[PDB]
Amino acid sequence: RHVRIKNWGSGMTFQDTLHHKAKGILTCRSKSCLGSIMTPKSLTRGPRDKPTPPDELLPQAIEFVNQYYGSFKEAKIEEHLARVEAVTKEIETTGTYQLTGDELIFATKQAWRNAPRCIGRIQWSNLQVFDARSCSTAREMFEHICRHVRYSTNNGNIRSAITVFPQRSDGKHDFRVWNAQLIRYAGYQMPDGSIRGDPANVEFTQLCIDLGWKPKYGRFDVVPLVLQANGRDPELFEIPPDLVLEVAMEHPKYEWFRELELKWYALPAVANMLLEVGGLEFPGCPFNGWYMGTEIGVRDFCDVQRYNILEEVGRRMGLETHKLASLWKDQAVVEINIAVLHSFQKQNVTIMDHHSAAESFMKYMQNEYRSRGGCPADWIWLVPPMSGSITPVFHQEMLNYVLSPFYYYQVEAWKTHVWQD
Amino acid sequence: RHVRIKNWGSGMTFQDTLHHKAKGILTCRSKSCLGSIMTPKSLTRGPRDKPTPPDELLPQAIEFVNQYYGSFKEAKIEEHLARVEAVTKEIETTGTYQLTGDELIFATKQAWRNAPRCIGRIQWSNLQVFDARSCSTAREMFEHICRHVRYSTNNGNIRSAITVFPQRSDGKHDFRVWNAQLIRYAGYQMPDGSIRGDPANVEFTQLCIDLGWKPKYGRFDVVPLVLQANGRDPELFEIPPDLVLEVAMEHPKYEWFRELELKWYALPAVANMLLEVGGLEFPGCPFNGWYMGTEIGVRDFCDVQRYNILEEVGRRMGLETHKLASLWKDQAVVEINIAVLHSFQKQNVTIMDHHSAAESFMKYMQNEYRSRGGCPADWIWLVPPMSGSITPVFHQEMLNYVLSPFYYYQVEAWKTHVWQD
Ligand code: HEM
Ligand code: HEM
Ligand SMILES: CCOC(=O)N1CCC(Nc2cc(C)ccn2)CC1
Ligand SMILES: CCOC(=O)N1CCC(Nc2cc(C)ccn2)CC1
Ligand SMILES: C[C@H](O)[C@H](O)[C@@H]1CNc2nc(N)[nH]c(=O)c2N1
Numbered sequence: 001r002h003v004r005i006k007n008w009g010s011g012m013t014f015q016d017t018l019h020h021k022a023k024g025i026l027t028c029r030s031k032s033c034l035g036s037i038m039t040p041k042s043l044t045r046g047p048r049d050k051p052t053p054p055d056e057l058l059p060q061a062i063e064f065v066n067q068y069y070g071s072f073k074e075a076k077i078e079e080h081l082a083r084v085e086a087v088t089k090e091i092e093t094t095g096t097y098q099l100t101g102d103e104l105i106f107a108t109k110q111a112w113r114n115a116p117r118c119i120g121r122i123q124w125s126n127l128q129v130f131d132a133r134s135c136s137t138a139r140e141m142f143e144h145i146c147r148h149v150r151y152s153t154n155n156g157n158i159r160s161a162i163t164v165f166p167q168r169s170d171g172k173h174d175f176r177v178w179n180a181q182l183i184r185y186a187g188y189q190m191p192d193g194s195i196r197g198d199p200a201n202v203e204f205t206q207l208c209i210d211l212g213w214k215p216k217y218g219r220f221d222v223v224p225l226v227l228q229a230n231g232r233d234p235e236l237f238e239i240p241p242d243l244v245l246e247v248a249m250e251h252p253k254y255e256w257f258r259e260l261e262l263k264w265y266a267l268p269a270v271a272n273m274l275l276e277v278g279g280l281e282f283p284g285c286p287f288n289g290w291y292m293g294t295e296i297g298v299r300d301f302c303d304v305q306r307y308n309i310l311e312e313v314g315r316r317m318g319l320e321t322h323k324l325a326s327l328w329k330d331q332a333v334v335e336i337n338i339a340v341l342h343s344f345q346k347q348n349v350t351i352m353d354h355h356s357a358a359e360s361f362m363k364y365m366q367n368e369y370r371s372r373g374g375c376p377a378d379w380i381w382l383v384p385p386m387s388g389s390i391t392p393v394f395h396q397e398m399l400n401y402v403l404s405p406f407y408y409y410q411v412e413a414w415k416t417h418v419w420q421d
Numbered sequence: 422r423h424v425r426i427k428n429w430g431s432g433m434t435f436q437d438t439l440h441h442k443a444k445g446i447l448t449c450r451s452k453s454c455l456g457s458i459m460t461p462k463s464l465t466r467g468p469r470d471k472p473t474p475p476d477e478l479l480p481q482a483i484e485f486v487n488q489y490y491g492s493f494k495e496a497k498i499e500e501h502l503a504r505v506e507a508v509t510k511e512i513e514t515t516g517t518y519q520l521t522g523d524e525l526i527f528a529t530k531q532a533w534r535n536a537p538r539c540i541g542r543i544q545w546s547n548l549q550v551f552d553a554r555s556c557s558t559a560r561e562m563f564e565h566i567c568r569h570v571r572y573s574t575n576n577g578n579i580r581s582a583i584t585v586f587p588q589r590s591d592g593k594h595d596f597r598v599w600n601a602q603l604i605r606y607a608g609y610q611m612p613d614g615s616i617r618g619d620p621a622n623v624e625f626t627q628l629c630i631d632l633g634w635k636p637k638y639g640r641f642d643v644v645p646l647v648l649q650a651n652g653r654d655p656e657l658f659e660i661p662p663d664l665v666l667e668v669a670m671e672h673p674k675y676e677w678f679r680e681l682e683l684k685w686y687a688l689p690a691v692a693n694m695l696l697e698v699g700g701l702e703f704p705g706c707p708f709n710g711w712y713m714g715t716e717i718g719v720r721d722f723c724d725v726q727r728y729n730i731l732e733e734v735g736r737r738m739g740l741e742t743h744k745l746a747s748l749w750k751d752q753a754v755v756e757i758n759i760a761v762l763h764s765f766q767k768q769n770v771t772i773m774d775h776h777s778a779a780e781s782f783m784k785y786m787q788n789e790y791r792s793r794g795g796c797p798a799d800w801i802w803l804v805p806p807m808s809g810s811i812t813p814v815f816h817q818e819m820l821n822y823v824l825s826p827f828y829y830y831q832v833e834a835w836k837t838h839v840w841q842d
């Protein structure tokens with residue numbers, strides 16, 4: 001009836017029953033396990049050129065309404081029954097339906113709660129929701145986004161929020177933001193063959209240039225927002241500088257560290273995912289939380305395909321960077337990460353270290369099993385990129401599965417966009 | 422016809438077709454992925470009470486023979502034909518078959534090559550095979566094991582080897598080593614409830630005591646070998662102290678490190694797995710390689726359920742152990758691991774750091790794809806437990822699947838053994 005889950009670090013067990021409600025979209029079979037694929041198509045939700053048949057939609061809608069009313073501490077049969085009725089008639093007389101403000105709030109929080117790859121879910125109930133479903137132009141989208149950025153940045157005391165643009169209709173009037181993130185630095189391929197800035201963003205930066213943006217050829221240039229309104233061709237908008245809070249990096253001991261002249265933005269915001277709820281699809285729903293130190297210290301600064309600064313920090317510390325077995329790399333990554341946490345704290349900007357994040361997630365996980373007999377979780381994304389087994393999550397067996405509402409991936413907009421002009 | 426595999430660090434791609442030959446036995450469904458389960462039933466070959474029926478044996482046996490002869494650089498069709506006949510008649514006139522000497526060698530190396538959770542596979546063709554299939558008593562087992570240990574230790578210049586005991590017959594005459602490993606330290610529960618030694622080895626040490634072993638209540642006492650021959654009750658044998666090479670731990674910069682008085686054995690040997698080949702089952706086949714440093718530094722020394730010395734080392738270093746955010750745990754694990762590598766090196770005992778291991782695995786995986794369009798790999802076990810994303814394997818997408826020959830887990834012998842005396 002269930003799958004038994006064990007934590008080898010404490011001996012604790014959990015019984016997972018919630019997985020039975022999961023959708024059958026994972027590409028794993030008895031023949032092979034595909035769990036480690038980065039962007040599996042099973043987690044992606046591509047474009048459409050026609051509306052969702054009322055046929056397929058009605059069940060999901062009812063299913064969602066039931067999920068929503070069931071969550072109430074006290075049944076409300078009348079309201080529940082009446083809502084089930086309203087939704088049915090609406091789907092028949094219009095071909096789709098509209099969620100109420102309260103249902104949208106519930107949905108965005110539940111989709112977060114159902115995100116397997118997110119270690120910060122213990123905060124799932126503290127989420128600000130900006131209802132931008134009546135948005136109609138690209139410039140209006142830009143204004144909602146600036147409001148979101150200002151609200152969440154909050155002078156360094158970061159707050160989580162999501163802005164929801166209009167739901168998908170026939171799939172030809174999609175409202176979305178092409179950028180993978182709201183704030184991101186440019187990457188440029190220089191005339192001399194070198195790469196300046198974030199090497200993983202060269203392709204998108206080039207797209208911006210081709211759309212008219214003026215490359216500033218700097219190391220930390222914030223790219224503009226490429227906004228798509230009502231299925232129209234995308235329009236560029238630059239975020240005002242005063243809204244982009246940045247933290248300059250320093251090390252509490254190595255004074256030469258500031259000489260590297262490094263910095264990073266304080267707001268981590270995913271802008272290109274799709275919210276699925278009761279059969280409804282929202283292709284435009286940027287959301288943000290706050291940073292976990294290792295995202296910047298380990299991935300952005302130390303990935304070879306990113307800023308790749310590990311060797312330089314190594315030399316400056318005076319390590320034997322010619323001998324792998326000296327573990328100079330491991331010593332350097334810890335110092336770089338210490339600098340990230342120190343710099344954020346020094347400037348009073350919210351950030352979280354990976355130990356604290358791992359611990360809070362274990363608490364969250366335990367509450368989810370006692371509250372709903374399950375917690376979808378993707379071990380591969382939850383274990384931090386450094387000091388894995390030193391954290392409690394490493395020793396925790398987990399089940400990964402897709403529920404609904406859910407945040408899905410999408411295919412980059414520029415790959416499937418049919419340019420009108 | 423093929424799954425595309427990608428390395429996000431180098432952008433390189435792989436096309437996997439080998440997974441088609443895989444045995445459909447993983448518990449992963451379309452509704453939920455069970456990739457992070459430690460010891461799944463799908464990778465466990467339990468006991469038997471009756472010989473294996475030829476309807477299953479014959480097909481598998483032909484498969485193996487076909488696989489073995491296919492592996493030849495210059496086909497030998499006649500011999501291949503002869504073998505198929507011989508094996509068929511043999512299975513007919515006796516009910517089972519015997520592998521030849523070279524088929525056994527081939528089988529052990531292929532099973533290693535097929536081990537998804539082993540990062541040291543680049544050395545797969547370099548394996549000493551001790552053929553102990555004509556063994557009949559527990560005492561002979563002991564002597565075969567001492568020879569194996571002496572050969573493999575080789576005064577610090579560790580060599581890989583496997584010792585193969587008699588194949589399973591009716592499942593009531595199993596030849597096996599009850600110990601999880603050939604060399605392991607005891608764990609004692611004291612009268613007050615506290616634990617002395619390896620707390621993860623408390624149950625097995627108690628079993629040894631109940632069978633007659635005199636406890637020494639030390640922190641690093643090597644437990645005796647519990648050996649079962651021909652399905653009989655197990656016999657205890659203590660490994661001669663001179664055959665157990667140990668490395669005393671020291672730190673290159675911290676003189677106080679030696680005051681912790683820590684050491685570890687040089688030979689990592691798995692002794693409780695089952696080798697499956699052509700339908701045949703070998704429940705007794707201890708094998709060894711050489712250590713990867715993180716195994717001792719991170720897992721044995723820093724796991725909270727193991728020796729758990731992290732906090733003590735942090736204090737000695739004078740770190741702020743009251744603040745998770747100072748990342749003292751990360752600084753301390755690095756120092757402990759530097760000590761492990763330094764100590765082995767100083768005593769001239771083969772050991773391998775996790776960076777070199779990771780790099781060699783990438784080479785091996787590349788060759789595997791060029792050789793057979795596949796490489797079963799379990800991401801979760803291959804990424805080292807510290808500095809994960811700083812190694813190339815973290816960025817490599819992988820497919821996990823079960824081939825044949827293969828090394829399976831077994832149910833602990835003491836849980837299923839029916840005592841005669
Ligand atoms: C409150 C602070 C939060 C923290 C500390 C946190 C932390 C994280 C981290 C570290 C990741 C891994 C990112 C990566 O490796 O690329 C992640 C992923 C994710 N988070 Fe959270 N998160 C927070 C808030 C949120 C919010 C507000 C939502 C949605 C309402 C959310 C939805 C997700 C999703 C769907 C992913 C997966 C992104 C992907 O697969 O590319 N998170 N989060
Ligand atoms: C020569 C050097 C070798 C190295 C450095 C190496 C390294 C490793 C490591 C680091 C693990 C993970 C162990 C754990 O996390 O518990 C492992 C597992 C394993 N190794 Fe290798 N190994 C070597 C040789 C061998 C040989 C000779 C065989 C087989 C004949 C082998 C078979 C396996 C198997 C089957 C596992 C999985 C064990 C389990 O699931 O408990 N290894 N090895
Ligand atoms: C490579 C560029 O990466 C990024 O811009 N980011 C890294 C990936 C992603 N991280 C996040 C997202 C959220 C919502 C909360 C915490 N962390 C968004 C920020
Ligand atoms: C907790 C006790 O752990 C162990 O005795 N070991 C850890 C797990 C296992 N490691 C290995 C095995 C081999 C064959 C090669 C390298 N490393 C065998 C040794
Ligand atoms: C729960 C999870 O399966 C377990 O804690 C881990 C993960 N990674 C591992 N990988 C290795 N090399 N060795 C292990 O024992 C484990 N165990």
Ligand SMILES: C[C@H](O)[C@H](O)[C@H]1CNc2nc(N)[nH]c(=O)c2N1
Nearest residue numbers: 036037038380381815816817818
């Ligand atoms: C290849 C591998 O699956 C991939 O690089 C992963 C692993 N774990 C991850 N986990 C997180 N949190 N974020 C990531 O992008 C990745 N990338």
Ligand SMILES: [Zn+2]
Nearest residue numbers: 028033449454
């Ligand atoms: Zn799977």
